[PDB]
């Protein structure tokens, strides 16, 4: 007891130091940043908030524990008050209550008592200015607390957060409206909480009404104030409207627009993966392979760990339907390895045309595919592999006989081979002529693609791609 | 309360007069509760379950009357019944085949996109269960063989039920593919070899092919002359548009500049 | 052994000599781009260091 008793006091000062100065330096700094300039936004503290919340989402959040009583939530949410420069006294009173945890017997004011606490910035009379700071006070205590996931009676407090922070949404739409620049700072905060909206519902029931409530904030951001706001709302749509039926696939046509400009960076990179799985159910491979490839190369920085790895797993799924794929272990990660083992040997059976090997993969590894929901392709991927097998042979040989390729690709009969080659010509896969007597297939080398034709015509898209980046560099140069 | 409603479900209808009378009786249901959005008190959705079964047989009456717009009307309604925000509903009977009626009718019109999206009501359990859904997904598998042969062998035994009308349209959409698929391009295919797929004995369909295709009618054989066909060069004209490509290409070099 | 530049014909029996197919502009292009791959990758260290 004396050994562990003396080690209890030291830690809580650590949240009283860094976690204090988290919203003391940033929040007190963003005060003057959100009072003016306010260009854009920027307000880089809102993006610095991405380097805090996501950092806090591991440690320490607001809590932890840490061997404290979880008294940081009531501390900053009380006594806002605020006014002219005496707001420093509020930060000074935040230092005064630090000794309360270390001296007296500490008491936990979270949970049940957090209901009037979120009303206090309104009850302090008055805020009087920044809702994003109170939105932060209605989120950063509660939303990182959601990671506990105890599911008992505190989920309605997570809903009470989504209630009183919807009262912040009441102050979001009603207040300002003219050169706000807090909404663009809130578009990062409103995004997050709207993601926590979706997350909290997934543990109880998927949201039917919030789907209607999503289009509310969706449409109302147009055209008055929209920067990055509708994109994050469109991400909420395509995320869940994918996993749940129906008709949401073709919905992307009337929504886009794009919506420009893509923000922020990797945030829009995953969006191409979302519509990527969509366009995969449209059966169009070519537009799906370019949006999936662009989804990996445009996505920084990780780690950790498998969040980027699992999304990359199902990303190369469109490559299984392309018909041209290499062995995917070049994309393997030691952490993703154990999870991709049932999905690994799959593509290894795609490179071969054996039915007994391909069907054995579906039987044993089909259990892993149930969680992915990828069973739509397994019926049409049989027709994809037979195109890869015939392309391997047709590219390796000038002439290929139907009887020799019959059992080599084990089509087993001459009649269905005439049906496959016919549809292969219909799809433009093979140029082979066929001489029908028994019959047999006699092809010839295809040429004249040459030099003067394809490379210089493709270079029209290459330079038009490059000369636009010259403007992209100038536009990016004009901001500094 | 209200009714009589389901009393006409067992006897179906001798003609289309009773089908319109049931639609007229269904109008009183559409005037009060309509199709939505009453959550309740889910007991107010009980007559909707009663409204489903008569809309289920209404789609069976729609294929009996052959009217296309009415057929997709009863299906889209029932499509939104299970799509409704309340997923807990008592099990019905005709729900099985009517999900396949519009499924196979949409395969007859060749659309691939809306085929798989209709099975998305229970996509994970398609291959797992519901043998009624297992037949069309295995039927589309045979269309890629192609079949022709394997489809007609599976056309020997089907539950089905009611697919008899759609498998006749599944014929015509397959029958016109014998001319489209097999060529281009083959050289010459013998008389009875083409008859093996077309079955019959000496039908007027292959006689209509000799007219429509043209192509060739040879003795005891068919020819692709001449030749294989049209002998594409393709063209010496595109040298023109190649100079057109340099126009805007040199202009893009001047835009930088 | 490069001592002889040409190609034979097995069917009709005529040996054809061609010194034609030069390599000039191409290797002078792609090989410089392969080196340019070391310019960006080595600059990726500067990029990620100054930003975070």
């Amino acid at each position: 007891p004396p050994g562990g008793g003396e080690q209890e006091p030291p830690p809580p000062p650590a949240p009283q130091d860094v976690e204090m100065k988290e919203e003391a330096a940033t929040g007190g700094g963003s005060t003057g940043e959100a009072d003016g300039k306010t260009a854009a936004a920027a307000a880089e503290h809102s993006q610095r908030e991405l380097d805090t919340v996501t950092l806090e989402d591991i440690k320490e959040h607001v809590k932890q524990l840490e061997k404290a009583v979880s008294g940081k939530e009531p501390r900053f949410v009380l006594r806002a008050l605020r006014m002219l420069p005496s707001t420093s006294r509020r930060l000074n009173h935040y230092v005064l209550y630090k000794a309360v945890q270390g001296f007296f017997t500490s008491n936990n004011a979270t949970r049940d008592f957090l209901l009037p606490f979120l009303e206090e910035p309104m009850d302090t009379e008055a805020d009087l200015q920044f809702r994003p700071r109170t939105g932060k006070a209605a989120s950063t205590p509660l939303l990182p607390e959601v990671e506990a996931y105890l599911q008992l009676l505190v989920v309605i407090f997570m809903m009470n957060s989504k209630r009183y922070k919807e009262a912040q949404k009441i102050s979001d739409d009603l207040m300002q409206k003219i050169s706000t620049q807090n909404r663009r700072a809130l578009d990062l905060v409103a995004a997050k909480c709207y993601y926590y909206h979706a997350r909290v519902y997934e543990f109880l029931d998927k949201l039917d009404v919030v789907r209607s409530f999503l289009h509310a904030r969706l449409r109302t951001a147009t055209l008055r104030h929209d920067a990055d706001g509708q994109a994050t709302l469109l991400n909420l749509l395509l995320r869940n409207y994918l996993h749940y039926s129906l008709y949401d696939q073709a919905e992307k046509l009337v929504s886009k627009s794009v919506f420009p400009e893509q923000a922020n960076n990797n945030e829009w990179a995953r969006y191409l993966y979302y519509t990527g799985r969509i366009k995969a159910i449209q059966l169009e491979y070519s537009e799906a392979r370019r949006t999936m490839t662009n989804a990996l190369r445009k996505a920084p920085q990780h780690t950790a760990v498998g969040f980027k790895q699992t999304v990359h797993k199902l990303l190369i799924v469109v490559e299984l339907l392309l018909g041209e794929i290499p062995d995917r272990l070049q994309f393997r990660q030691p952490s993703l390895k154990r999870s991709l083992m049932p999905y690994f040997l799959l593509t290894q059976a795609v490179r071969t045309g054996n039915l007994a090997k391909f069907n054995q993969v579906l039987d044993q590894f089909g259990e892993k595919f149930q969680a992915d929901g990828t069973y739509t392709l397994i019926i049409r991927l049989r027709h994809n592999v037979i195109k890869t097998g015939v392309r391997m042979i047709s590219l390796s040989y000038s002439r290929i006989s139907l009887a020799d390729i019959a059992q080599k690709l084990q089509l087993d009969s001459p009649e269905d081979a005439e049906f496959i080659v016919a549809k292969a010509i219909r799809d433009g896969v093979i140029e082979a002529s066929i001489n029908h007597e028994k019959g047999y297939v006699q092809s010839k080398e295809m040429i004249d693609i040459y030099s003067t034709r394809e490379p210089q015509l493709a270079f029209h898209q290459r330079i038009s791609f490059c000369l636009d980046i010259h403007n992209m560099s100038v536009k990016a140069m004009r901001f500094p | 309360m209200y009714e009589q409603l389901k009393g006409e479900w067992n006897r179906k209808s001798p003609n289309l007069s009773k089908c319109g009378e049931e639609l007229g009786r269904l109008k009183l249901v559409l005037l009060e509760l309509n199709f939505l959005p009453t959550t309740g008190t889910k007991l107010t959705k009980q007559q909707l379950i009663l409204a489903r079964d008569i809309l289920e047989i209404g789609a069976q009456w729609s294929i009996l009357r052959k009217d296309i717009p009415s057929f997709e009307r009863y299906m889209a309604q029932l499509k939104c019944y299970y799509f409704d925000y309340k997923e807990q509903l008592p099990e019905s009977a005709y729900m099985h085949q009517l999900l396949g009626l519009n499924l196979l009718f949409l395969l007859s019109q060749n659309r691939v996109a809306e085929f798989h999206t209709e099975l998305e009501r229970l996509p994970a359990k398609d291959i797992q269960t519901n043998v009624y859904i297992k037949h069309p997904v295995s039927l589309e598998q045979y269309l890629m063989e192609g079949s022709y042969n394997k489809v007609f062998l599976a056309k020997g035994n089907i539950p089905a039920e009611s697919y008899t009308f759609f498998i006749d349209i599944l014929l015509d959409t397959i029958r016109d593919e014998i001319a489209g698929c097999i060529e281009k391009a083959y050289e010459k295919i013998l008389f009875t070899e083409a008859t093996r797929i077309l079955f019959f004995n000496t039908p007027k369909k292959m006689t209509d092919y000799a007219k429509k295709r043209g192509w060739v009618l040879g003795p005891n054989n068919y020819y692709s002359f001449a030749s294989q066909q049209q002998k594409p060069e393709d063209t010496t004209i595109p040298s023109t548009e190649l100079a057109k490509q340099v126009i805007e290409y040199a202009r893009q070099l001047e835009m930088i500049v | 052994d490069k001592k002889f530049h040409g190609i034979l014909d097995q069917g009709e029996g005529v040996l054809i000599i061609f010194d034609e197919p030069p390599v000039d502009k191409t290797y002078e292009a792609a090989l410089e781009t392969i080196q340019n791959m070391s310019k960006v990758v080595d600059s990726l260290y500067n990029k990620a260091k100054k930003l975070t």
Partner: peptide
């Protein structure tokens, strides 16, 4: 071909070097 080859590397000279010198002054100042 050359117009395609020059504009590719001229960009690599223009695009890279501009981004380098820009962020060196821009972010290190504030």
């Amino acid at each position: 071909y050359l117009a395609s080859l020059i504009r590719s590397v001229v960009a690599l000279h223009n695009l890279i070097n501009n981004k380098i010198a820009n962020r060196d002054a821009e972010k290190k100042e504030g």
